[PDB]
Amino acid sequence: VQLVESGGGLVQPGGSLRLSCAASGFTFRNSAMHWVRQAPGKGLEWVSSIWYSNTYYADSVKGRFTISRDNSKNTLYLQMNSLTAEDTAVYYCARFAGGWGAYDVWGQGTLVTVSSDIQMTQSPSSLSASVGDRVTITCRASQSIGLYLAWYQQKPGKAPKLLIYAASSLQSGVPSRFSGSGSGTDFTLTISSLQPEDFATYYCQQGNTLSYTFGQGTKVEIK
Amino acid sequence: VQLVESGGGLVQPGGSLRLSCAASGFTFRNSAMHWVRQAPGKGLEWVSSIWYSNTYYADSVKGRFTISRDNSKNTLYLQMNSLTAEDTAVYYCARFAGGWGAYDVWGQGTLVTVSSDIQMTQSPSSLSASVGDRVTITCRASQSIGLYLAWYQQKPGKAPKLLIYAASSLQSGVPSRFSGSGSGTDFTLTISSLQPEDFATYYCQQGNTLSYTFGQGTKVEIK
């Protein structure tokens, strides 16, 4: 009882790809077949279902992907169109045992990478502080970005606001308790004495490279 | 100096939507304009840019979205096609100061929700244990799934393997040190005495509802 997948590969965003899942060792025609995917380092996510015929799709792929089957070849297909980087994942086909509500046979998986630079690692992800505390947030770049590192403040329900650019230059009107430092790959934002209005999420952003990338944010929360 | 967005709303997967960003208080024709988006509860992500004419797109939207501008109306547009749930986000337009490498004017944001649903909360996300330890993993459903809860084991580079279905039934061949319990909304997987082959990631999955959602996984790691 086996499911053998094929068709994965590297594809440009906006492009198309068709996955195949060849079954053997069981009566393919009788069985409900699903696709489930797993982004790199992430969890399992249901994608699509087909049975003997009402087919179903998750909102992640509905309207772009088509599931189908050729019972004479004991094969399941996933036609993937208008691909995005967010579709990058290992795609598994699986047999669904509808009496159990569970998948009892899995393919080996096939990797689909949707791709045509600099990673920004912000730390900590969150911190709790009190009014009056000194706070320092760090942002590391995987490659030198020179001085082109900016810091933004974002309050709940509001747009980001530029505070610091070129690593250490303050935007007009930004209070002097904010300062920035660093060059190349290591950068710091410091708040000298936290005020109530400063509890917010802070983001760094590199502006040296054509695909501008943001740090993941630091939530400055109240003790 | 303002950016006023419009166009967001609720759209079906696979559908289209056009966002607008009306500029005032500054000379629009000279300025590089970008779109940056933020999924609910997540960080900022660059989407697309346009200047006076070479336009750029992130791999998340390249080949599906089109950025454009009408200088006579001082307006920036984002044409969104072939939409996915992963496009759900607040979309910001922003003026890019190319000398600073930073965004110095931001719109107020407009929300795009791409949608046509049990939530499974697994805990803990990870745990360290030693050979011989008793381990319990819990899975909670946002509403009753009855008994239709399954548990899978996944080792690095391998496909998931069914261990338990219908909350407490073991798949054939699964060792007796694995057991499951629970009904309705609270479920538990227990390993009575951990063996080296049991260090793996474990996933729960509800099979009561047509969306078949997975828990986020529990990584059982070695002390």
Numbering used by the authors:
A (entry chain H), B (entry chain A): 2 to 53, 56 to 119, 125 to 231
Sentences from the paper on this structure:
Diabodies are among the smallest of these bispecific antibodies. They are constructed by connecting heavy-chain variable fragments (VH) and light-chain variable fragments (VL) with short “GGGGS” peptide linkers. Therefore, the two VH-linker-VL chains associate to form a dimer with two antigen binding sites, each consisting of the VH and VL fragments from the different chains. In order to investigate the structural flexibility of the Fv interfaces of diabodies, we have determined the crystal structures of 10 mono- and bi-specific diabodies with and without bound antigens.
During this study, we by accident determined the structure of a non-functional monospecific diabody. We had intended to produce a bispecific diabody, 6277, and to try to determine its structure. To our surprise, instead of forming a functional bispecific diabody as expected, the two chains of the diabody had been shuffled and a non-functional monospecific diabody had been crystallized. In order to understand what caused the chain shuffling, we compared the crystal structure of the shuffled monospecific diabody and predicted model of the intended bispecific diabody. The core part of the interface between the heavy and light chains is conserved in both the shuffled and the modeled Fv domains. The main difference in the structures is found in the CDR3 loop of the heavy chain: in the crystal structure of the shuffled diabody, this loop is displaced by ~4.5 angstrom relative to that of the modelled bispecific diabody. However, the nonfunctional monospecific diabody form appears to be selectively crystallized under our crystallization conditions.
